[model samples]
Target: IVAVDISAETEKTYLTHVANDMVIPAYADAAKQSDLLHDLAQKHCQKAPVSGDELQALRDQWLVLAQAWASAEMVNFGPATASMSNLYINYYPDERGLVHGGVADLITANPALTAEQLANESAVVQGIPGLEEALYANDSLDAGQCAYVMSASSALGTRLKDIEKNWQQNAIKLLAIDKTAESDQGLNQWFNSLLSLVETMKSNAIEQPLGLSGKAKGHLPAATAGQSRAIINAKLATLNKAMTDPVLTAILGSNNENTVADTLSTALADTTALLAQMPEDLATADKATQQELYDHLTNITRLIKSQLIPTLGIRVGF
Candidate 1:
């Protein structure tokens, strides 16, 4: 008879590595970028007439911050999930047009809304989506609209810093080892976050924008800013990092399941390579290239489900 024991020590190591090396650093970058973005937005709003160059600069910085948020969002379990930060940061597929309406209403109701005041407003009009509506939906912002933009940017920065602080302060408890459950719920959350991210990247970011899943065409995330592809690339890069982290690799290695690691790495690399060759504006990419990219992401999902999870003996549907 063979008896197997799950120590959870390595799981703890994996959690610690992810918190310190991946999640914390990613949020730090996002918070830093959001501050920069807010600074630029403030400067843009202060000028007598918004400089086209400055406006463009603000848009450029928005992409930088957005990409950072995208990368950090893959962790999706600690402070980010607890606060429902994703919806606030990157709400999309707004078939109801809530963001547009919310922005218009806020501008009319109170043009000089402070970030603190804006926090009391609906989330659809408070983060990247709201900022994008203000910045990109128009060629230039009126005084009121510019104020709204500043508020959104400032609010986003504040939220990101709060998330970073919480993660830094409470990581130990959040990643605690619980042997009472059949499996480590922390590890399951991490793995499920990865799966959920890839699934979102494939479905909402790609398929919906492509009109493959019965949604309207041209509804791409970050489409107003012409950065749908960049967002996807940033997310794929983060997934690659998390999946190939040394601690995770060691876990698979201890089980003599290195082949599973290799397969996942190859799948991610192939997806990234294919994405590199596609157009930066994903909605405009050729059908064949888009289909190929989708297939690669699908393959990664399959490998994680059939190979990595099973090999690691991680529970699903936690």
Candidate 2:
């Protein structure tokens, strides 16, 4: 393995790049997509009968917003993390039953529930997964369910707008490399967030969905299958951003003829190749193939956490 110096300066520059080039752009796109989704939901619900094309539009926009959300969520800090933003944006390990129950209750009671009210509901029923129930379920769609989706999606748009604005104003301070009473804290928090992201990829994205816990395989399909297997795309986003800089070549010691960097580069390349082999919707793949992809991901994340992070002298907070 290569061993590289832990340069606070390097990390600061890298994180600044990530914030400017990746995170903020993702949130901005998500805000726009969410706004369109909210508008489409309203248009459909207001019509006498929701058109098939309109319903398809809702699904399509949701996927676009979801992909954008996946990328920004990896940042795990700044404005996106504020106000419990993620919980309201894309909570996972979904409770399908909770979504069903919540929506069912709303449909039955026929009460006056506002978007603001739904935003305060259980995480399961307030975000992308909740909207999935209304949008993707084979069951019939009604104004009640569309009501929930419109409110939820509208709240999502409003929330992301706030997050983007906050980050826009605060990027310089947040990306500072120096820390003192006079300056904002530096890269440690961001480093820990990356550690957390890797853990999430290993434990939740791979393990929980694949049922490595021994209860049952495919027990938590929502983790992998929901929103067109978004967890995979989320994993891809993390790897892409991490590799942008602070890559193995930089962090692993420079004198080793680039051994670790070469190895990790090959691994990620292979992983990306294998990912492309699977269907775009991971749920459509066979079990063995799914397991291979899941294990492949765990290997890559473990490599980064064990070799790269440790060599960088960064602590994995979780």
Candidate 3:
């Protein structure tokens, strides 16, 4: 175990860096894109006879919103977690195929479902995947389907705004955490949030999709089908940005020999390069290459848990 000494400068710089670069900017992008998606959905629905161009525009806007949400998704902690914000904004592992079926039932039964009603529904049918099912199910959409899309976008936008508001007033402050404090509540929560994001990437995007759960039965990853590669790229970019931020190197330098950050940087670089070359269609990718990618990710997670955690002397999840 490494004896750690976290300086006030380290805390201040790291906190300010994350606040200025990671949290505020990321949330702003997601919130702005969410508003755009809502507006596009409403505009498409208003078309007396929704045109192909209108629908296409909605689709385009949804992808932009998704990319923005993907970047901000890493900060799913504090007020975000307390409110189960990820579920409200995006839930995963396909959750036993709940999004499609539940959405279909909800729309069919309640063509008049309001955005407020949809907001109260199960997370499965309240987020991006749910909207995808309705908007992209076919070339054109019916009145009920369009209504669902509208409600989903509206609910998603409101949820994002609420979360962003909380983040600026509460969640953002959690970043100015000191590991040595007696409570260390803020620091521990921050660590858990990071771990949760990494675990989601590992389990949902990689492990579940790859059918490496070691379970007795195998089926499909009910969500994110055909999009795992994009998820990998998005998650990798977010992780790489955070890991490679120079302030982090300065913080970890206090650890004797500077091996902790070096180990992580090397592992992250190797994992990213391997992911960059991954086949567009992972289902058809070379088995050996897939396994290699999996191994590297597993190793990196192990290093974070056993090495980085110990070096920082920060407790993670209970």
Candidate 4:
């Protein structure tokens, strides 16, 4: 039997499959479909709205859902590249080509990104597959499936754009009622820059688009269903642990920090309250239950980050 080699390429990333048996291609198709759905949801979320002080507030809500969707996707597609590094092992040894690689230390991927960066990555991941073209302007494709990949990817990308736009417009319009000071006012310039970095990223989510067209469509992934999900969740869990750690709260004097004594006590209570209830409500599958839980959780996280954290005098999260 002749071994078949497959190549999928685009602007930033490449995926390839080399197999003597036709069964490999068949497997690739199944894996690719799941990848498309996940790529789809992430782009959808990028479009959330955040206009004025909304960026500060959004820091709480946006990533949570994004994380969930991404975690779910990673669960579906496995790891994209080396866990923390640039090298991807998919095309290396035949056995290591697993969609979710064991070397997760390579992909130290962050969930947060500026809107444009997200679009850029989406563009690359959902690109046409193949080698570079001989002509400078001309391009080579790993396969003809890139357009299809992008289309599936864009289903999510477009939604994210809408979210960002809505965020910027509504906050500016609604918060205009209380114009005693621009949100940026009184913020130290460095602090302002920090906010700017955070703001631009969240805003760009929707303002940009992943240029995926309508042709690419091939799959060649090898990993268990929930493997990628487990890895990302494990990574985020590491961050989540320290994200709002109470010990650090007192050390930094984050205005949001409550107190050292309560850090272990009340903070745990409050934190537990925030993390626990939303999932519970969502599980009920009632729209009202979901909204009610969201409304409360959103307010609570904001209070901790904005009012509580600042009240403690710290600039960063725990």
Best by TM-score, which number? 1
Badly placed stretches (over 4 Å) of model 1 are 1-6, 177-183, 213-218
Where does candidate 2 stray beyond 4 Å? 1-3, 6-9, 110-113, 138-140, 172-176, 180-185, 217-230, 246-254, 280-284
Per-candidate Cα RMSD to the true structure, in Å, reads: 2.6, 3.5, 2.9, 23.5
TM-score of each: 0.92, 0.83, 0.86, 0.26
**Which residue pairs in candidate 3 collide?**
none
Best by lDDT: 1
Q: Write the per-residue lDDT of candidate 2 for residues 1-318, one digit (tens) a residue.
A: 344655555566665776777668878988998998998888878873464877878887887777777666667777776767777777665533466566566645644457787655766667776676667764345767677778889888888899888888888676554442233245556656665665676566566655555543322323322544554565575565565454435645466635555656677777677767776666567878777776777776676667655665555563
Q: In candidate 2, list every pair of residues with a backbone clash.
A: 2-252, 2-253, 3-252, 3-253, 4-253
lDDT of 4 by residue, 127-177 (tens): 111000100111221122222223323333344333334333443232222
Residue 5, model 4: Cα distance from true site in angstroms? 61
lDDT of 3 by residue, 191-298 (tens): 566666777766666666566656412212223334445656666678778766787767677647378778888998898888778765455567677677778888
In the range 127-223, model 1's lDDT, one tens digit per residue, is 8888887888667778888888878888888888999999899887776644424457777777888888898778877876687657554367787
Q: Cα deviation in Å at residue 276, candidate 1?
A: 0.9
Ranking by TM-score: 1, 3, 2, 4
Q: Which stretches of candidate 3 lie over 4 Å from their true place?
A: 48-53, 172-183, 213-225
